[PDB]
């Protein structure tokens, strides 16, 4: 029943150093990804190209704001960039998350179309265009991340002469409903960013595997190899996104559910202190992708 409140040491400059490294690597790799996608022949731009471009754009937008968070963490959680940049950086973080998961969902749906229902794939390509899908996913990401832009603010919480960039549910709720608003926003973000998109992803992958089981005894070898390459890079991207954003969402949801389950003091403190590392791991995904392209996609190696 001691109920400590402080965190474990300060992690030194490890989190800011990782943020800066991800900033450099993500900028370079995502610029190279966009250049490779938009430099090749436009007639040879597959449907995966637009989703890869949107993924790179989201990663670039997030890694642009990453140095601000590195500085924030370096100075013992002090925000010197004002309320506007707090709002913009947090909004870009959530926009990156939503856009990345939506683009991976689109890639998985495209693989399901081209692997399970080639005729329906052609029909949907005739109906659904890549530009429309990209615009819809980006607009949806912006709308879903707007609450963070609205509610985030900067305040000298706790009287430590350190302005902190925190979500302020004071405007949209009283004290008695601050927890309700926080839990609702967090659960909705976790759902629409990691549960529904990954449910769609897993359904698509299950049907792809079911069709490939039969395809192991039939189908053209060359087309099978091309599908293998594209499906491999897309599955690697999906799995990397899962491993990177699963600690963040899991710890967030556990913390939210702790209020309902009345979790012990020690577990709440442990989640509190482990959350920054989950946040760093989630940020690393914005730079991990170009290396995955390099090691798997033959097109990127050629360029």
């Amino acid at each position, epitope marked *: 029943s001691e*109920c400590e409140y*402080t965190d474990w040491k300060s992690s030194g400059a490890l989190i800011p150093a990782i943020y800066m490294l991800v900033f450099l690597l993500g900028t370079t790799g995502n610029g190279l990804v966009l250049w490779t996608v938009f430099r090749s022949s436009r007639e040879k731009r597959r449907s995966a190209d637009i989703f890869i471009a949107s993924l790179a754009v989201a990663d670039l937008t997030f890694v642009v704001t990453l140095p601000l968070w590195a500085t924030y963490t370096y100075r013992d959680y002090d925000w010197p960039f004002g309320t506007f940049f707090c709002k913009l950086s947090s909004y870009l973080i959530f926009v990156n998350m939503y856009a990345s998961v939506f683009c991976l969902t689109g890639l998985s749906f495209d693989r399901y179309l081209a692997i399970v229902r080639p005729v329906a794939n052609a029909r949907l390509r005739l109906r659904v265009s890549g530009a429309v899908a990209t615009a819809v996913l980006w607009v949806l990401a912006a709308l879903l991340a707007m609450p963070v832009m609205v509610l985030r603010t900067t305040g000298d*919480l706790e009287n430590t002469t350190k302005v*902190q960039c925190y979500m302020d549910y004071s405007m949209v709720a009283t004290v*008695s409903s601050e927890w309700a608003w926080e839990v609702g926003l967090g659960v909705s973000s976790t759902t629409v960013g990691f549960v529904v998109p990954f449910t769609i992803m897993l359904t698509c992958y299950f049907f792809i595997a079911q069709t490939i089981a039969g395809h192991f005894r039939k189908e053209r070898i060359e087309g099978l190899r091309k599908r293998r390459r594209l499906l491999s890079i897309i599955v690697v991207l999906v799995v990397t996104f899962a491993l990177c954003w699963m600690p963040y969402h899991l710890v967030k949801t556990l913390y939210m559910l702790g209020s309902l389950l009345h979790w012990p003091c020690d577990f709440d403190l442990f989640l509190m202190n482990i959350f920054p590392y989950c946040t760093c791991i989630s940020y690393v995904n914005s730079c991990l992708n170009p290396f995955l392209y390099a090691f798997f996609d033959p097109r990127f190696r050629q360029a």
Partner: nanobody, 129 residues
Framework: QVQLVESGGGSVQSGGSLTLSCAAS????????MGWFRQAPGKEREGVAL???????SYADSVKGRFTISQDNTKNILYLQMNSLKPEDTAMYYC???????????????????????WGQGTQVTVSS
């Protein structure tokens, strides 16, 4: 629905030790942060001892060492041991609960919102000489 109830804080001459406590309701360690404030007649209310995520528990200059704040989550209680009083310690004390920021922010207690948070009824700690 967070509610607070005070206790103790009677009348003891200078250099004594007052055992003072505040109960709680609907407030958990993961949702609210507690603190003891004092308001003295003729001047403004001040902070005495705040349960503070950063820098640990925070104390006022006039209460360093002499006071001690503890919290029990199971019973949802907050304590204070006003040992070695001074003639200037006569004031009315309150227990205040503020919402705790989300895990994304860092779970810092929202003490700037201390006015909008739930405040205890208070007790007239009458420290004599």
């Amino acid at each position: 629905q967070v509610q607070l109830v005070e206790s103790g804080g009677g009348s003891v001459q200078s250099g004594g030790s007052l055992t003072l406590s505040c109960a709680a309701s609907g407030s958990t360690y993961s949702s609210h942060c507690m603190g003891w404030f004092r308001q003295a007649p003729g001047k403004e209310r001040e902070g005495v001892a705040l349960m503070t995520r950063s820098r640990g528990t925070s104390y006022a200059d006039s209460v360093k060492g002499r006071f001690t704040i503890s919290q029990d989550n199971t019973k949802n209680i907050l304590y204070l041991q006003m040992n070695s009083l001074k003639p200037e310690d006569t004031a009315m004390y309150y227990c205040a609960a503020v919402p705790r920021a989300g895990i994304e922010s860092g779970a810092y207690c929202k003490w700037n919102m201390k006015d909008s948070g739930s405040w205890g009824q208070g007790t007239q700690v009458t420290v004599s000489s």
